[PDB]
Design a protein around this ligand. Structure first.
Ligand SMILES: COc1cc(OC)c(/C=C/S(=O)(=O)Cc2ccc(OC)c(NCC(=O)O)c2)c(OC)c1
Length: 82
């Protein structure tokens, strides 16, 4: 059934957006909107999601429709954060 699923991304500065689980869409497209909805840009950010007290670094080329229902984190790449 054509349901509208969503995945919420925590933007930089501890904000949070929500994007539909865009099928055939990479993180970059979906969450570049996410940045722009805060007024930010996808250039200076990285995308990785916090799991069990840990971090699972996602790829900007990752298909976002697999990350549905799961909240992501976008963290500013300042001086290459590990
Ligand atoms: C900060 O930048 C953004 C922040 C947003 O939010 C904080 C939204 C979007 C909010 S939203 O409410 O439209 C998400 C959304 C979509 C579909 C849903 O069901 C199908 C539901 N269901 C739960 C509910 O209705 O609350 C929620 C944003 O969108 C581009 C950008």
């Amino acid at each position: 059934s054509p349901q509208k699923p969503i995945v919420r991304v925590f933007l930089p500065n501890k904000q949070r957006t929500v994007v539909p689980a865009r099928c055939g869409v990479t993180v970059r497209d979906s969450l570049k909107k996410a940045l722009m909805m805060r007024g930010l840009i996808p250039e200076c950010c990285a995308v990785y999601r916090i799991q069990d007290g840990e971090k699972k670094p996602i790829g900007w080329d990752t298909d976002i429709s697999w990350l549905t229902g799961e909240e992501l984190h976008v963290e500013v790449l300042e001086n290459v954060p590990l």
